[PDB]
Write an enzyme that holds these catalytic residues in place. Structure first.
Site, short mmCIF file in Angstrom:
data_model
loop_
_atom_site.label_atom_id
_atom_site.label_comp_id
_atom_site.label_asym_id
_atom_site.label_seq_id
_atom_site.Cartn_x
_atom_site.Cartn_y
_atom_site.Cartn_z
N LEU A 5 -1.75 2.07 -2.09
CA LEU A 5 -1.94 0.65 -1.87
C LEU A 5 -1.07 -0.27 -2.73
CD1 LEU A 5 -5.82 0.70 -1.59
CD2 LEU A 5 -4.12 0.66 0.28
N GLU A 6 -0.56 -1.33 -2.13
CA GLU A 6 0.23 -2.32 -2.89
C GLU A 6 -0.79 -3.10 -3.79
OE1 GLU A 6 1.92 -5.51 -0.39
OE2 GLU A 6 0.36 -5.05 1.12
N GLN A 7 -0.30 -3.80 -4.80
CA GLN A 7 -1.17 -4.52 -5.73
C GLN A 7 -2.09 -5.49 -5.03
OE1 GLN A 7 -1.00 -8.03 -6.67
NE2 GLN A 7 -2.89 -7.70 -7.90
N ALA A 19 -3.50 -5.18 -2.25
CA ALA A 19 -4.56 -4.48 -1.52
C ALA A 19 -5.62 -3.80 -2.36
CB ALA A 19 -3.94 -3.41 -0.57
N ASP A 47 3.48 -4.98 2.10
CA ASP A 47 3.14 -5.75 3.31
C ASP A 47 2.38 -4.93 4.36
OD1 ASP A 47 4.61 -7.95 2.25
OD2 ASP A 47 6.48 -6.94 2.91
#
Ligand SMILES: [Ca+2]
Length: 316
Positions: free
Chosen positions: A128-130, A132, A95
């Site tokens: 980075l998260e998936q 992003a 998030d």
């Protein structure tokens, strides 16, 4: 000004860990355990790369200590730097709302430099998260800003460290994430893939006629060895990353990640010695996380730096 130093991590292996910039809740762990809140100066010295989690935010991402003044946070980074330990700021996390827009390269470079000058950071980790990795113009703006930051500090005689902590399945051939790695060729210092939270993902190893998943404890040593061999040679469906710039990322315990925790420490020692015997020696270990490494289980059992105690001897 000790915080102004950017410690070198060349010529040695690293034991890297993440430090949480938010307070523990009553049961954040994957087994309902609780992580420890701590100052940077409470971190065992064996952790020689500390990644602060996380720089985040819409527009131009940013960071502010959740419970320390800027002056006090910089003072603690200065203590670590005086000890030869690097402190990175990690961009990303869940998030994070990171959606960089074309044209914002210099504004992002300027904010990274501001965080270095204010807090004493020695580099940046990309986590980075998936959602992003392919969002907005992250693919182009982030590598462009980082090259400018690296060049800026190199002109001052300082090596601004750049690292990345991709989920391991991001690194398969034709992976969208490879654009970051390729864009940063010659600029990133190391890549530390997460060998956790992807329990069902696996690799086919012809040498063993075996399908080995990341959640297979019986064959943990072979999973660590063969996924690493595949990644540092570009085989078994993975793209290649240089072994000298490669770090294996592991959960500090079962509360830190759903799956991936190494139950038997010898699996890591053996994976390293096997890589060494093939001239595929790697850069070290990364763990999520330092706060978890000193947290406690749901039943109140202290983790008591289990990861650091098990693996620091391997690194040093
Ligand atoms: Ca510094």
């Amino acid at each position: 000004d000790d915080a102004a130093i950017m410690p070198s991590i060349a010529n040695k292996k690293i034991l890297m860990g993440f430090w949480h910039n938010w307070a523990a809740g009553a049961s954040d762990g994957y087994q309902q355990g609780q992580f420890a809140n701590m100052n940077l100066t409470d971190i065992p010295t064996e952790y020689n790369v500390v990644a602060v989690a996380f720089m985040k935010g819409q527009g131009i991402p940013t960071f502010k200590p959740y419970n320390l003044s800027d002056t006090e946070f910089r003072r603690q980074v200065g203590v670590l730097n005086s000890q030869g330990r690097a402190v990175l700021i990690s961009l990303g996390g869940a998030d994070a709302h990171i959606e960089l827009k074309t044209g914002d390269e210099d504004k992002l470079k300027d904010e990274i430099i501001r965080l270095v000058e204010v807090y004493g950071f020695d580099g940046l980790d990309i986590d980075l998260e998936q959602a992003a990795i392919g969002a907005a113009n992250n693919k182009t703006v982030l590598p462009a800003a980082l090259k400018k930051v690296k060049d800026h500090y190199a002109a001052q005689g300082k090596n601004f460290i750049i690292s990345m902590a991709p989920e391991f399945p991001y690194l398969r051939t034709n992976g969208t994430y490879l654009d970051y790695i390729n864009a940063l060729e010659g600029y990133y210092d190391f890549i530390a893939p997460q060998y956790y939270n992807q329990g069902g993902d696996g690799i086919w190893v012809d040498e063993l006629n075996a399908w080995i998943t990341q959640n297979n404890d019986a064959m943990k040593e072979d999973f660590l060895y063969y996924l690493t061999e595949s990644l540092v040679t570009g085989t078994r469906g993975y793209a290649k990353i240089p072994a000298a710039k490669f770090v294996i990322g592991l959960p500090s315990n079962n509360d830190a990640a759903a799956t991936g925790y190494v139950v038997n420490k010898q699996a890591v020692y053996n994976a390293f010695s096997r890589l060494d015997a093939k001239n595929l020696s790697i850069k070290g270990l990364m763990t999520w996380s330092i706060n978890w490494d000193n947290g406690k289980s749901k039943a109140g059992v202290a983790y008591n730096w289990e990861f650091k105690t098990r693996y620091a001897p391997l690194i040093q």
